Nucleic acid binder design. Structure first.
Lengths: 273, 273
DNA sequence: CGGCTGGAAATTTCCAGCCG
DNA sequence: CGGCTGGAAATTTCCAGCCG
């Protein structure tokens, strides 16, 4: 029999709570889960109906897939994994109640120790490999279903892993926002210096992207002009038509190179010089 | 004889480094230091020359001078205090390799037990009156010099403290710096909105203080206008005289109410409306 | 109306670029 | 080298506006 993932966890949007951030750790939602239409990581077991159990371990994003040092927490969880006895009355299973608790880089080796002890190693990565560089900001759910064989004896199906989940409370995964701007208008020749206040960005990865219908231009600044990740001082780019004779609304917005990700558009209105 | 401080340690702009950064910290410069002519904490022993020793403990900022949890680190340091043989043919003493290593709040209790065990209590504060919170953002060096008397026996002179050395890590005890400003000129009628980029302030304890001979005025903004502690968007106050006939350069600077502290003055040049 | 939880901040580690 | 730095991560604790 074989497990299928008919609903992957939302790749970006969840934040790993340290075992200190309050009482909640979250509840990983599905790839198409909205503030109205809530979906969740669901699997389908092809070719089997009846008694069985499900275990959701966490494993490294990358190919040598060792058990991750972070923990899964919530209903039915224990020692960093989930484990609920499946339902015979259904074949499509959803989990609308699981959270990803990140551990401190300091307590990483005490995490993996517990991985060993509790026999949590979906892909039985030999001990000599428990060592290495654990990418703490990306995990993969590893659904390991157990159904019965013809003789009724428990039959462990192969492991099925999801695509990476990503900790929002991380450098590049946080959202883009333009809180304030000293000026929303300027000259079509550009050159106007603009002070834009935003949310924590990375001077190494950020852009002020200007756009209109068929037009495109970046504002000019540098890493030096990105004051405390939360303010950028740059200069507007020239407009398409330089010798304007009337205004032209275009839209200004923050753009992150790495992801091609944008912020809500702030109307900028180029004017005749 | 009696010790005096010919040169106090620079009160601000220096962050205290933790052990996780090194058993050696930058080194406290003299209050009168500048890129060109470097200065260091110096003391003068009035009425004595020849054999002697000098210990530099750290003690709390306010009156009951309990030995601080923090520790001094650098040449000739050990157990959180400096110690060294006084030059016997000189009377002015410089200390150019002194660093302040801040302990973690958690490790505070281990800190003071070390003060006890090593008998570091310049002002002999009893265990009774040692109890209390320790302001970990402000310390004071406490030079304890020992010379000999004519008969020849070691004579411990009384203790002399410096003025607080403030850890920049703390925005209320830190050095107000104005990094950038979109405009340094405006109208005598005021009203010009200004975007000023500074170092970590505290929305509810910061001010943009304008000034001139017989004139002072605050800029208008609110806590809502203090973006993520490192930017203030305010509006310039009217000048003393609205009938200017030519630029009148006053000085703009950050002021912190809690301690009436100021930042280096940025020239602002009011102009005729 | 006070107890629950983002968003702000305070606190601690780590790191790159540098300058003598 | 290495020690400085200054800046930003990593982590933890704060806090005000919810909410009921």
């Amino acid at each position: 029999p074989y497990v299928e993932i008919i609903e992957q966890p939302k790749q970006r949007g969840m934040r790993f709570r340290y075992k200190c951030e309050g009482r909640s750790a979250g509840s990983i939602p599905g790839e198409r889960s909205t503030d109205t239409t809530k979906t969740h990581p669901t699997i389908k077991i092809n070719g089997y109906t009846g008694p069985g159990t499900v275990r959701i371990s966490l494993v490294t994003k990358d190919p040598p897939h060792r058990p991750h040092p972070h923990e899964l927490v919530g209903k039915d969880c224990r020692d960093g994994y989930y484990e609920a006895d499946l339902c015979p009355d259904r074949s499509i299973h959803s989990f609308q109640n699981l959270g990803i608790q990140c551990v401190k880089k300091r307590d990483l080796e005490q995490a993996i120790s517990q991985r060993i002890q509790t026999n949590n190693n979906p892909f039985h990565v030999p001990i000599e490999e428990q060592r290495g560089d654990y990418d703490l900001n990306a995990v993969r759910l590893c659904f390991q279903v157990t159904v019965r064989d013809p003789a009724g004896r428990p039959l462990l199906l192969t492991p099925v892993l999801s695509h990476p989940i990503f900790d929002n409370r991380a450098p590049n995964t946080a959202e883009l926002k333009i809180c304030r701007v000293n000026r929303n208008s300027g000259s079509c020749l550009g050159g106007d210096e603009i002070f834009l206040l935003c949310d924590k960005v990375q001077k190494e990865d950020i852009e002020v992207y200007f756009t209109g219908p068929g037009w495109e231009a970046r504002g000019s600044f540098s890493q030096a002009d990105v004051h405390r990740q939360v303010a950028i001082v740059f200069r507007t780019p020239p407009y398409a038509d330089p010798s304007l004779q009337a205004p032209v609304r275009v839209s200004m917005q923050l753009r992150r190179p790495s992801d091609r990700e944008l912020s809500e558009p702030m109307e900028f209105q180029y004017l005749p010089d």
